[PDB]
Paper text:
The main protease (M pro) of coronaviruses plays a key role in viral replication, thus serving as a hot target for drug design. M pro is able to process polyproteins to produce several nonstructural proteins (NSPs) necessary for viral replication. The recognition site of coronaviral M pro depends on Gln at the P1 position, and no proteases in humans share a similar cleavage site. PF-00835231 is an inhibitor designed for the main protease of SARS-CoV that emerged in 2003, but its clinical trials were suspended due to the rapid disappearance of the SARS outbreak.
The resolutions for these structures are 1.79 Å (M pro G15S with PF-00835231)A, 1.68 Å (M pro K90R with PF-00835231), 1.65 Å (M pro M49I with PF-00835231), 1.72 Å (M pro P132H with PF-00835231), 1.64 Å (M pro S46F with PF-00835231), 1.66 Å (M pro V186F with PF-00835231) and 1.91 Å (M pro Y54C with PF-00835231), respectively. In each of these seven complex structures, each SARS-CoV-2 M pro mutant molecule appears as a dimer form, which is also the form with enzymatic activity. Overall, each protomer of the SARS-CoV-2 M pro mutant binds to one PF-00835231 molecule. The results clearly showed that the ligand binding patterns are not disrupted by these mutations. The IC 50 value of PF-00835231 against SARS-CoV-2 M pro was 0.0086 μM, while the IC 50 value of PF-00835231 against SARS-CoV-2 M pro mutants, including K90R, M49I, G15S, V186F, P132H and Y54C, ranged from 1.2 to 3.7 μM.
Author numbering:
A (entry chain B): 3 to 299
B (entry chain A): 3 to 163, 165 to 300
Amino acid sequence: FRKMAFPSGKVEGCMVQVTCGTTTLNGLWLDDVVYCPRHVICTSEDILNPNYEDLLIRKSNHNFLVQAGNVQLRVIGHSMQNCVLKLKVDTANPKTPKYKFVRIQPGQTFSVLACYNGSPSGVYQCAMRPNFTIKGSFLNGSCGSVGFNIDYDCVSFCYMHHMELPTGVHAGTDLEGNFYGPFVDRQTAQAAGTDTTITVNVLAWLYAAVINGDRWFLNRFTTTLNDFNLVAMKYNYEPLTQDHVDILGPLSAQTGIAVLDMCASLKELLQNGMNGRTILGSALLEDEFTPFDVVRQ
Amino acid sequence: FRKMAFPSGKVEGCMVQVTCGTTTLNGLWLDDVVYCPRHVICTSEDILNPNYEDLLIRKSNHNFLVQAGNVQLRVIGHSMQNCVLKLKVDTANPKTPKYKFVRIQPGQTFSVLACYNGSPSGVYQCAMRPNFTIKGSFLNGSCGSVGFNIDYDCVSFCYMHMELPTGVHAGTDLEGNFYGPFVDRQTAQAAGTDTTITVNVLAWLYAAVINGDRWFLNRFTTTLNDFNLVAMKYNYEPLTQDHVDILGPLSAQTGIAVLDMCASLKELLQNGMNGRTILGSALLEDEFTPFDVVRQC
Ligand SMILES: *[C@@](O)(CO)[C@H](C[C@@H]1CCNC1=O)NC(=O)[C@H](CC(C)C)NC(=O)c1cc2c(OC)cccc2[nH]1
Ligand SMILES: *[C@@](O)(CO)[C@H](C[C@@H]1CCNC1=O)NC(=O)[C@H](CC(C)C)NC(=O)c1cc2c(OC)cccc2[nH]1
């Protein structure tokens, strides 16, 4: 059982480089539109406090250099949607997949294709944290890298990368340009809200361990849903809802372990610690596998 | 630090399915050759003690069903190289990347594109253990999935996918030679006892130093032989000359001589971590290569 990303080929064919003046970043080329973070129009001075509509009206189509591989695409129009710039080009991307733009919910996972200078570099799985950060791996020039899920050849784009917080976690927007979380595309040191642990995912991951032959953390006890949630909130875990209980059904039926039985196991792990033992190779409780992630794998 | 896979698109375009009788697995289509595990030719009555040479004589080109999706590729020749079958087909794959076949050493990392019926399912990083197993995530039908590294758009294929009774996985290089002492028969096989990948732990310590976490740097050095003798008493792999040289770039970057870092690790092995952490963790990580570290740092 490993963190597994979706195959990235359908997205790789869409990554381009966008350059405005001295600033370059990545763009997403779908049909005849290139989507990229709007701060590509800011100079190192503008970015401390950018008035984006005022800066964008002063730019011309020819101010934007878009490169796909080596070939330059001609920008024939541009509009802004929240924090995302939409550059219209005279060439349709012939490798555009079936796609949708979606805004994901906290606790849901997606694959990130990290890119630099329009070139894909790496792929890995992230979860949208409850405080709307993600724990990714992004360096200078990664802005405009995207996150996505794939379901039967349809790519659902959910994330476009914008910033790294002082704590080293990351923040970005959906493909409509609205940030996840309270962040703003200005060059400032921003803190997130206090993060919490994705309870339903920890439970799904304990089920994954049982499906894979590890049972050491199980116990004879049970708990009520409310009593579990009282302990969970005390340990900065998210509440577990009845919808979460229902979503864990298949894993429960597959293993024959009642959800609230597994909740009692997690309660014990939380109150007694792991005592130096490991689960699926981890010395920490893992919360970035969803129940679907476990089933799909 | 994230386990990051290479973008998989260049390999996705090479995946096909190969069927013999009722047995379907995955194959790798490069130029006009499809490479796949030779046990596709076995029936349930052959796999226990297969005589591959006599089984292959009874096969003809028209016994092999090779499909890119649902499109059949006509087989025009067949041969066996060690544990791989090579089916010559009448169409050169237009998506063939620049590629090489490489045999990796223990400790090296690579991306696995897990595939089923020729259709890529997910991608993730693996490390070759010193006992020549990988901790993969493979189900029924995964055989023929490949592992690879990508350097300047050249794909170096290193792995073609058995699951041991312990749940780890074994396979061959693309010339059909198993990593480790395994054979392609339907038989419960055991790997040698594993060891910790020393060169990768040292890479991890360099990564910590790069990031300002350097409490473990001491005032000692060691000879390579003295370190290797200690390492073996703690179930750590001995270092080779090649290991010393691939640590060269990180040693230059930090100014910490390789043998000085060996002396720091030796102290950690003999005394333990004393409840202290390195890069946030009480456990030393051995699945990041020196290349992986320079890439994320
Ligand atoms: C982009 O790629 C910009 O094109 C860049 C991506 C990060 C660089 C290092 N790792 C990354 O993920 N994003 C930024 O540089 C953004 C730009 C904003 C959205 C206009 N800024 C930050 O991520 C940022 C600014 C500051 C800061 O200021 C002062 C202080 C502390 C942290 C910090 N992060
Ligand atoms: C390929 O899909 C087969 O074409 C399959 C992959 C494994 C299935 C479960 N996870 C995998 O990685 N491979 C096999 O089933 C191979 C086939 C051989 C090479 C002919 N066999 C095994 O992996 C195998 C057989 C036995 C066994 O016997 C008896 C006893 C214990 C373990 C075991 N593994």
